[PDB]
């Protein structure tokens, strides 16, 4: 059961996607949800949008619009792999096909302070879609909740500190804040750009190394 959505597509391109969905006996959404299977972008790059990033975290096909043109011209569902955006999207799709944990499984996040460039609610949607859990109180390395969390992060290397230091205080960068150190106890301080870069590459990126 296919469910198509466009991200960054022109009006003409959206019309073609709608026409393709009919031919494929698929649905075409305009709002993302977890039943989406195919996200179509206009060119060779993942768009830096909530839809594309939710598509990555769901393991969707992220495909160049040439796939749509080829499907309509040849009147078949062309094989997705030839049109897939490489790196993050493919790594995530393969991750989902192998039934592996989501990118931020085992990780906990506290969204600290003001967010002007990345609406906080978008970060919450993303980290939740990626298997992360929200902390409602700021972690203090010397406190009750943060000393009792003992999860592991599947997408960290087993020998890295991110394997077992799985709590993240997220702050908005480009706002003149620089933590003295990136980690205190089990708690990292990470900029919102780190979070975005993780999703776009489908990697739990290091904050030190």
Curated annotation (Swiss-Prot):
GO biological process, one term: negative regulation of mRNA 3'-end processing
Domain BRCT: 1-85, 99-209
A GO CC term assigned to this protein in UniProt: nuclear ubiquitin ligase complex
Keyword terms of this UniProt record: ANK repeat, DNA damage, DNA repair, Isopeptide bond, Metal-binding, Nucleus, Phosphoprotein, Repeat, Transferase, Ubl conjugation, Ubl conjugation pathway, Zinc, Zinc-finger
Superkingdom of the source species: Eukaryota
Subcellular locations according to the entry: Nucleus
A GO MF label: ubiquitin-protein transferase activity
Function: E3 ubiquitin-protein ligase. The BRCA1-BARD1 heterodimer specifically mediates the formation of 'Lys-6'-linked polyubiquitin chains and coordinates a diverse range of cellular pathways such as DNA damage repair, ubiquitination and transcriptional regulation to maintain genomic stability. Plays a central role in the control of the cell cycle in response to DNA damage. Acts by mediating ubiquitin E3 ligase activity that is required for its tumor suppressor function. Also forms a heterodimer with CSTF1/CSTF-50 to modulate mRNA processing and RNAP II stability by inhibiting pre-mRNA 3' cleavage.
Subunit structure: Homo- and heterodimer. Heterodimer (RING-type zinc finger) with BRCA1. Heterodimer (via ANK repeats and BRCT domains) with CSTF1/CSTF-50. Component of the BRCA1-A complex, at least composed of the BRCA1, BARD1, UIMC1/RAP80, ABRAXAS1, BRCC3/BRCC36, BABAM2 and BABAM1/NBA1. Interacts with UBXN1.
Protein name per the record: BRCA1-associated RING domain protein 1
Source organism: Homo sapiens
Section of the entire sequence shown: 569 to 777 of 777
